[PDB]
Amino acid sequence: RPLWFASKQSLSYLDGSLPGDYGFDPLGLSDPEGTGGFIEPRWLAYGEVINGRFAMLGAVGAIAPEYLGKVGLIPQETALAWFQTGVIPPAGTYNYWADNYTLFVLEMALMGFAEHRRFQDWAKPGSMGKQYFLGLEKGFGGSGNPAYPGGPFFNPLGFGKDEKSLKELKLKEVKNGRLAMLAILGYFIQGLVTGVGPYQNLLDHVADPVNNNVLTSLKFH
Amino acid sequence: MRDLKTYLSVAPVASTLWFAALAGLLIEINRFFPDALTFPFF
Amino acid sequence: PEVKILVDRDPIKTSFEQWAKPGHFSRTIAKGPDTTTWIWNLHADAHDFDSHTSDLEEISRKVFSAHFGQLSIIFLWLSGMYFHGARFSNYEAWLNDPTHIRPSAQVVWPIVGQEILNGDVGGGFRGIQITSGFFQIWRASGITSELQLYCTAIGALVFAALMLFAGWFHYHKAAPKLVWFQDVESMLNHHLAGLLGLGSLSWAGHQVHVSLPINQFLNAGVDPKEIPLPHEFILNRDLLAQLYPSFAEGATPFFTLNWSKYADFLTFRGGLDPLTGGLWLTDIAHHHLAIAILFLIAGHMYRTNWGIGHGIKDILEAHKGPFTGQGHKGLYEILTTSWHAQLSINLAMLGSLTIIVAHHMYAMPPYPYLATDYGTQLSLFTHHMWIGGFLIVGAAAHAAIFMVRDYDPTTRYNDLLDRVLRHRDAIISHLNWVCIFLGFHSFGLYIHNDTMSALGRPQDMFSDTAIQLQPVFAQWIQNTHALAPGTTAPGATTSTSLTWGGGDLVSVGGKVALLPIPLGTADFLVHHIHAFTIHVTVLILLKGVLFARSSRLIPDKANLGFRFPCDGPGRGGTCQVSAWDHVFLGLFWMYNAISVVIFHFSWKMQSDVWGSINDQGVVTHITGGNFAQSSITINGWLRDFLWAQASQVIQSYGSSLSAYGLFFLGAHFVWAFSLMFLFSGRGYWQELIESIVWAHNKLKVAPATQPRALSIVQGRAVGVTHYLLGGIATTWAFFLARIIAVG
Amino acid sequence: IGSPTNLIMVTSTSLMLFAGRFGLAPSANRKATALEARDSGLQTGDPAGFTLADTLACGVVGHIIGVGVVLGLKNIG
Amino acid sequence: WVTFYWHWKHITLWQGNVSQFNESSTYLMGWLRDYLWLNSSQLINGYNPFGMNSLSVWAWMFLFGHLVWATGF
Amino acid sequence: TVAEPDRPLWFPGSTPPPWLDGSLPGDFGFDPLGLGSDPESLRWNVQAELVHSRWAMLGAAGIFIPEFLTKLGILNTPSWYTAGEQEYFTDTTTLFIVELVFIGWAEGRRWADILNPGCVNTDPIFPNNKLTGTDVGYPGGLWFDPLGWGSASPQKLKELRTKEIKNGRLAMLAVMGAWFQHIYTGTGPIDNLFAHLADPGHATIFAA
Ligand code: CLA
Ligand code: CLA
Ligand SMILES: CC(/C=C/C=C(C)/C=C/[C@@]12O[C@]1(C)C[C@@H](O)CC2(C)C)=C\C=C\C=C(C)\C=C\C=C(C)\C=C\[C@@]12O[C@]1(C)C[C@@H](O)CC2(C)C
Ligand SMILES: CC1=C[C@H](O)CC(C)(C)[C@H]1/C=C/C(C)=C/C=C/C(C)=C/C=C/C=C(C)/C=C/C=C(C)/C=C/C1=C(C)C[C@H](O)CC1(C)C
Ligand SMILES: CC1=C(/C=C/C(C)=C\C=C\C(C)=C\C=C\C=C(C)\C=C/C=C(C)/C=C/C2=C(C)CCCC2(C)C)C(C)(C)CCC1
Ligand code: SF4
Ligand SMILES: [Ca+2]
């Protein structure tokens, strides 16, 4: 059980049973003594999982079209930085088949259904496999564990059929996510100070590591 | 719901509603019939 | 001892059931009224939480959520001010021509004749001139369009919603534990470093990126619509660099400690910008930066979870000496137990602060085109004086409520408090003497001057031309400030404030902003009046606190409560022995003191400061420098101040200022109305009511809620409330009509 | 590098880091009165009880001393 | 009220300016401005920084009353 | 009159309020503010929702059908928004007073029915006519149910009444839809429909 910056508070509750546990909570945020909304340790674990997964997707998709745009078959009209995609209009914008606000309403609808039902599995497990949902209900009954509902939709290949491999793959998902969150954070700060996109920034550091934007600390759009 | 109607029946709230209606009424009357020191219709 | 987030879930159920049960909080009031007195008690006890329950945790939760309610109201009020600035203001026209246009942010409907109050404020705009000062703030913040004001009003409304939500949330869902509130080191660490520090730093950020540049384009005469938007200065650093070249570096001088190169937009010049008459925005941004550093440092003093730092209890206990015994031992237990104690200290310091703000904002006008807007300046000074004085009287009230309710030497003892209580007679006797001495040797000098002037002996008066009482000490002080820049402040270019340094008169739009304020026998006499009035207020309030428990007249006084009318006609008569009645009596003296202060301000500023200046530099003050020779006599205050300067408010009928005439007379009316309550007593009124009740029973229209005269205490409270409202609003109308007409 | 400011910054910094490191400075595990030993509860791989909280503290103190000294050196000569 | 009434009606009669009472006595600001304020002018100047006159004894007394009254409070 | 515990709710997973058991037609468990929390107010509001639903269905017809036909080469009917300004065979006010009299009669008798069920079923002139309905809000009789589709078994009446209430809810939303559209856009609703069908990604709320 490797421990990183543990404390007497942290080791009082961080048991090692939680996937990815290194006994690290110097602020005692997962302390089970005082518990109201959103300071439940369970909620913080499910939150680290969800933030981690979304951060994997974003860490990939933010740098992907730039890289493929460097040397690849993607049209350079569509190969941009993540922040010039139209996400941030003053950083850059692109005209899609929609006005980017209708895109936002649409995505908030779809994410509306997915996220609302996900939450209903958190608040009442298995409640999403009962009311008529044009089928699909069976995979929406959940595994009893909200972060890991599995079933046919979310775990069709059923990796980690034994508890050992599932626990190792959970440790893996946790560290993968903790890496991806720091990744997208790095995209934020790099694109903030550098402004050329994360991969082009890395390349500015490749041919010339002596570049080292740290000491420069210059910023332009 | 029943308790809320009860609260809305309490003295200060009924008073604000009542006098607010009365004020709107008197204001509009002085809007269509301004000035007037007398009852002119006799 | 491990500081952490602590709450409880769903302590109180959200329901309208107790909305429908008036007085639900009190076991007696909840039974409903048998008499009309019930109706008053329901309102007097509504916020007295520690009378509703004895559980400290419940009280703390009520207090916390209530603070959320207050902040919600404040954000709704700011939303109102910004929205009226966007939708019903002439702020853009004023933004073009500030020295001419009058700021107006309220427009009235044409219903009953009242549209006359929509006066000519300039910019082709009819409305009510505002003295709050929001135009100078918005200009100092770089705000140009009404749209920006709209966005600020919407954000303010959203934050009102968030604060209200958090109040409901932390009373009904996640309500902090009592240990959470008592974590004082955590709270002080987060309010010093987090709230004040990061707030000041954030504001310095907005100023260096928005306020400074946009104000550079405004001062350079650029049209506000042609000024680049504030974020264009963040994007293209060439705009800023053209205005402020240092921004070409890329904050490398900050990390390399080359900070002197930032002397471009971070400055210690001091004084006033002669174009705007306000303080240099470079000095102000630099100021907020320094303050940010100081508070960020101050927020690491107290130990929490990592062993480094201070425990406050340790610091208290170490501080004791041969005169004070074990003093400070026990104060950590009192200040983490009694809400009224904390509220007492915080009211004292917050009111004292508000008064200091009142001085510093006139003597160092922080916003552009604020100094020359005399209506706004007079309004601000007077306003903050009133807030301060009220808050201080409150501090006395809650020191008294602590003494009566939370003081217990058998449980939470303190040596200093015990010793004070053990020579309260000496303290109050000496304060009494000082008050008499100050009365004679401040006001009696005025009476001396009136009598000598009436007898035809002006050479026997106390005057700059007869018997001089020069404020030598203050004069020496302002001289030292005048000499400070270059000597004891070599970084300071000019004087700290133009009231100190000779010369360097600042004028904007022909009107003066600040010049050196003279000091003489008149100022001496007035200042001793202020000393006198303050000392008598302190006497009444401190006497109220120290004898709240007991006295030689009433040994068991604490058993009668904090707020009680008397202990009867015996012992010679014991009316107004309660600490509450000492707060009642002290309110009148706070009114007296603050009244003379603001009269001193208006009089002195119109006589020796404000006025118009010639093209060749000849200054004509609003009044003819008549402070030195006319204020040294009570007749001069009656004649050359009240009788003279009231002409505007009694001549306001038929103009847009006529509302101030109406409020003049009406405030006189409510003030005289208070004398009915203050001079009489409820026995008479209850008997009269007996006859009126007879008349109603005769016609079958007597109410079941039996009519009762007000309580003795309520008689006093009504009385002092109307006295204060009438006097203060009278001076309000007087001031605003006067300074809006002649300013 | 690129300045003598670096020498004074690593000087005050590393001097305060050394102070809080071994002894003769109120570390997280050493409380002072007018240096008593106490437990922070926060574990550290370093065997001498010099923790991360005290690492941050001694660094920032070395920067307060360092920036104050360098600004006292440049604004004089 | 009785004596304010009498003295204002007569002081306007004696000046040939009866109209001033007739028009100004119907609103209270008229009483405050055109009776008390207006007729205090010579009184309050019975003595001033520029000298005295026979009205000083009435100026002094005028304040004396203001003082005694207020002391009563 | 049949409780329905496992009915599909508006918020799957949520618990329906205890005053909504599934007996009412169109009961999806939706009353988050407890507006029908007491039985009296729920009764009243059932009548309300019913009348609003029917008026909104007639209105949805009167807006959408004539706007749609006149949009084609079929009719000349003007815009529903501005139909009040038109000059008909007499002034609109006197038409409105006519309306208040006759509609006042109908609504008055419906009123007497809600406050005193059954007391209003007889013709005050020709008593042999009468009305067949036994439920408030579904009067029946030859006038209001000539085809008899309204007097039937439970579960069939629940099916049909559920259809009526759902159609009426949709129609309320649609009438207010054409309202806020005509205020926001400058055309009739069918032009909003076509303009949106041409470029749905763009021609939306955010084309303005
Ligand atoms: C850096 C952290 C921080 C900050 C910024 C604040 C800020 C504030 N506190 Mg708090 N507090 C803190 C930590 C903090 N506190 C800690 C650690 C404790 C001890 C456990 C307390 C306990 C405490 C009590 C008991 C009370 C306050 C109160 C206040 C308000 C005082 C009035 C004022 O200045 O209005 C200025 C207004 C603003 C600056 C607007 C910004 C406010 C934002 C929205 C809040 C930002 C900080 C917030 C705590 C973040 C948490 C949000 C998140 C959990 C969802 C103020 C907004 C009083 C209060 O609750 O008023 C309602 C009060 O009664 N504080
Ligand atoms: C103008 C009205 C008035 C006056 C003159 C006073 C006078 C005084 N008040 Mg009072 N007060 C007033 C209104 C007034 N009050 C009202 C309306 C209230 C109700 C809220 C109070 C409530 C109040 C409280 C609660 C207290 C006072 C206190 C005091 C004393 C303060 C100490 C002092 O200054 O001594 C010096 C005296 C004077 C300045 C008065 C003028 C002196 C003249 C000019 C000297 C003339 C002397 C001369 C030789 C006379 C001899 C002539 C010969 C024929 C006899 C003082 C005597 C405080 C106190 O007790 O004292 C410490 C106290 O606690 N007052
Ligand atoms: C949308 C609407 C009501 C919406 C109410 C809602 C969402 C309330 C929901 C909730 O409260 C519940 C239930 C439960 C609570 O716990 C929670 C909330 C969420 C609070 C009514 C519309 C109601 C709409 C109606 C009644 C429309 C009728 C139309 C008529 C009569 C005809 C009009 C015209 O004739 C003109 C005037 C001119 C012609 O040219 C054209 C035509 C159109 C023909
Ligand atoms: C634990 C703790 C406790 C103790 O006691 C103390 C301390 C230590 C303090 C703490 C803390 C820590 C930390 C640091 C944390 C962090 C986290 C994060 C960062 C997250 C993120 C997270 C993140 C996330 C989700 C993200 C995501 C993302 C995404 C999707 C993206 C997207 C996109 C793309 C693709 C592309 C386009 O074009 C753009 C966009 C649209 C943009
Ligand atoms: C473990 C290890 C070791 C050791 C190391 C060391 C020695 C470390 C340390 C240390 C360090 C590396 C330090 C540094 C630091 C820093 C910091 C801590 C920061 C600070 C900050 C801040 C916060 C600042 C602020 C400020 C000031 C001061 C004033 C003005 C303003 C400003 C902002 C500038 C050895 C080699 C033995 C072995 C291997 C590994
Ligand atoms: S007169 Fe009133 S206040 Fe005075 S002792 Fe009697 S009851 Fe008490
Ligand atoms: Ca906790």
Question: What distance in Å separates residue A43's CA from the closest CA in chain D?
Answer: 25
User: CA of E16: how far to CAs of C116, C186, E19, E30, in Å?
Assistant: 34, 79, 8, 18
Pick from D52, D63, D70 the residue to mutate for probing ligand 5's pocket: most ligand atoms within 8 Å of its CB.
D63
Q: In 3D, which of A71, A55, A11, A90 has the Cα closest to residue A200?
A: A71
Strands annotated E in C353-510: 506-508
Q: A75 is written with which tokens?
A: 């049209």
Contacts C260 to D, Cβ<8 Å:
74-75
Q: How far apart are CA C626 and CA C520, in angstroms?
A: 12
Residues lining ligand 3, Cβ inside 6 A: F 31-33, 35, 52, 55-56, 58-59, 62-63, 80, 83, 172-173, 175-176
Q: Residues C316, C331: contact at Cβ < 8 Å?
A: yes
**Residue C695 belongs to what domain range?**
1-743
Nearest chain D residue (CA) to A28: D42
Give Cβ neighbours of residue A77 (< 8 Å, ≥ 6 apart). Answer: A94
Which own/partner contact pairs does C712-717 have at CB distance under 8 Å and 24+ positions apart?
Answer: C712/C565, C712/C566, C712/C681, C712/C682, C713/C563, C713/C564, C713/C565, C713/C580, C713/C581, C714/C40, C714/C44, C715/C677, C715/C680, C715/C681, C715/C682, C716/C565, C716/C576, C716/C581, C716/C584, C716/C677, C716/C678, C717/C584
Q: How far is the CA of A135 from the centre of ligand 6 (A)?
A: 82
Sign of the torsion angle spanned by Cα atoms C32, C36, C41, C44: positive
Distance from CA of A160 to the nearest CA of F (A): 29
Mode of pairing for the β-strands spanning C619-621 and D30-31: unpaired
Collect all residues with Cβ–Cβ distance below 8 Å to C419 and sequence separation of at least 6. Answer: C324, C325, C327
E-only strand ranges, C256-405: none
Chain B CB contacts of C22 under 8 Å are 10
Q: How far is the CA of F52 from the centre of ligand 3 (A)?
A: 6
Chains F and A touch (3+ CB pairs under 8 A): yes
Helix or strand holding residue A162 (H, E): none
Total domains in chain C come to 1
Element (H, E) at F152: none
Q: What spacing in Å lies between the alpha carbon of C436 and ligand 2's midpoint?
A: 8
- Ligand 4 is surrounded, with C-beta below 6 A, by A 25-27, 29, 51, 54-55, 57-58, 61-62, 82, 85, 87, 181, 184-185
Is the CB of residue C519 less than 8 Å from the CB of residue C561?
Answer: no
For residue A7, give how far its alpha carbon lies from the nearest alpha carbon of chain C (Å).
Answer: 10
Give me the residue from A31, A37, A90 closest to C173, CB to CB. A37
Q: Do B3 and C16 touch (CB under 8 A)?
A: yes
Do residues C138 and C91 make contact, with C-beta atoms less than 8 angstroms apart? Answer: yes
What part of B 1-40 touches F (C-beta under 8 Å)? 1-2
Whether A39 and C5 lie within 8 Å, measured CB to CB? yes
Which one-letter DSSP state was computed for residue C653? T
Could you tell me the distance, in angstroms and rounded to a whole number, from the CA of residue A70 to the centre of ligand 3? 56
A7:D52 CB<8 A: no
Q: Residue A144: which of A163, A126, A156, A166 has the closest Cα?
A: A126
Instruction: Give the closest ligand to the alpha carbon of residue A50.
Output: 4
- Chain F nearest CA to A59, separation (Å): 28
Cross-chain Cβ contact D43/A26 below 8 Å: no
* Nearest CA, atom 31, ligand 4: A58
Q: Do E49 and C458 touch (CB under 8 A)?
A: yes
Residues 6+ away with beta carbon under 8 Å from E15: none
Query: Any binding-site annotation on C590?
Result: no
Largest interatomic CA distance in chain A: 62
Residue D5: strand, helix, or coil: helix
Among the listed residues C453, C477, C455, the one whose alpha carbon sits nearest the alpha carbon of residue C467: C453
Query: How far is Cα C408 from Cα A10, in angstroms, rounded to an integer?
Result: 39
Chains A and E make contact, 3+ CB pairs within 8 Å? no
Residue C611 DSSP label: E
Which one of C254, C259, C262, C308 would you mutate to disrupt binding with D, by most D Cβ within 10 Å of its Cβ? C308
Measuring from atom 63 of ligand 1, which residue has the nearest CA?
C64
Contacting chains of F (3 CB pairs or more, <8 Å) are A, B
Tallying the residues shown for chain C, one arrives at 743
D23: enclosing H helix or E strand: none
- C639 and E32: CB-CB below 8 Å? no
Around Cβ D12, how many Cβ atoms within 10 Å?
Answer: 20
Please, what is the end-to-end C-alpha distance for chain F in angstroms?
49
Q: What does residue C50 show for φ and ψ, rounded to 5 degrees? A: -65, -5
Q: For residue C415, what are the CA distances in angstroms to A118, C94, C110, C329, D70?
A: 61, 60, 66, 7, 47
Q: Do chains A and D touch (3 or more CB pairs under 8 A)?
A: yes
Contact assignment for E60 to C450 by CB distance below 8 Å: yes
Q: Decide: helix, strand or coil at residue C668.
A: helix
Q: How many helices (H) and strands (E) does chain B have?
A: 2, 0
Taking CB atoms and an 8 Å cutoff, what residues of chain D touch A7?
A: 40-43
Task: Give the DSSP H/E element, type plus range, for residue F93.
Answer: helix F92-115
Cβ–Cβ below 8 Å for C456 and E33: no
- How many angstroms separate the CA of residue C418 from the nearest CA in chain D? 28
> What is the Cα–Cα distance from C104 to C119, expressed in whole angstroms?
9
Structural domains of chain B, with CATH: 1-42 (1.20.5.510)
SS3 state at D31: strand
DSSP C89-132: --HHHHHHSTTTSPPEEE---SSSSGGGGSEE-STT-EEEEP-S
Write the CB contacts of E66 (distance below 8 Å, at least 6 apart in sequence): C638
Summarize the annotated binding site of F for chlorophyll a as residue ranges.
10, 28-30, 44-45, 49, 52, 86, 99, 107, 109-110, 123, 129, 140, 149, 163-164, 166-167, 169, 181-182, 196, 205
Query: Inter-chain contact B31–C19, Cβ cutoff 8 Å?
Result: no
Please name the method used to determine this structure. Answer: X-ray
- Sort out which chain E residues have CB atoms less than 8 A from C462's CB and list them: none
The amino acid occupying position C306 is W
* Ligand found nearest the CA of D53: 5
- Rounded distance between C-alpha atoms, residue F106 and residue C211, angstroms: 67
The residue whose two tokens read 């369970």 is A42
Q: Does A6 touch chain D (CB under 8 A)?
A: yes
Number of C–E residue contacts, CB under 8 Å: 59
Interchain contact, D41 vs C259, CB within 8 Å: no
CB C680 within 8 A of CB C698: no
Interface touch A120/F12, C-beta < 8 Å: yes
Residues C7 and C4: their CA atoms lie apart, in Å, by 10
Ligand 6 neighbourhood includes C569 CB (under 6 angstroms):
yes
Say which residues have a Cβ less than 8 Å from residue F144's Cβ, sequence separation at least 6.
Answer: F131, F133, F150
**Other residues' Cβ atoms within 10 Å of the Cβ of residue C14:** 9
- Chain A residues with CB under 8 Å of D49 CB are none
Cβ–Cβ < 8 Å for E59, E47 = yes
SS3 F138: strand
Whole-angstrom distance, CA of residue C165 vs CA of residue C71: 11
Reference C44, options C568, C671, C690, C562; nearest CA is C562
Q: Distance from the CA of C283 to the center of ligand 3, in angstroms? A: 60
CA B7 to chain centre: 20
Domain containing residue C64: CATH number: 1.20.1130.10
Give the long-range contacts of residues F110-114, CB within 8 A, separation 24 or more: F113/F139, F114/F44, F114/F47
- CA dist C564 and C716 (Å) reads 11
Tell me which residue range forms the domain holding A68: 3-221
Q: Which tokens sit at C496? A: 């700290």
**Structural domains in chain A (count):** 1
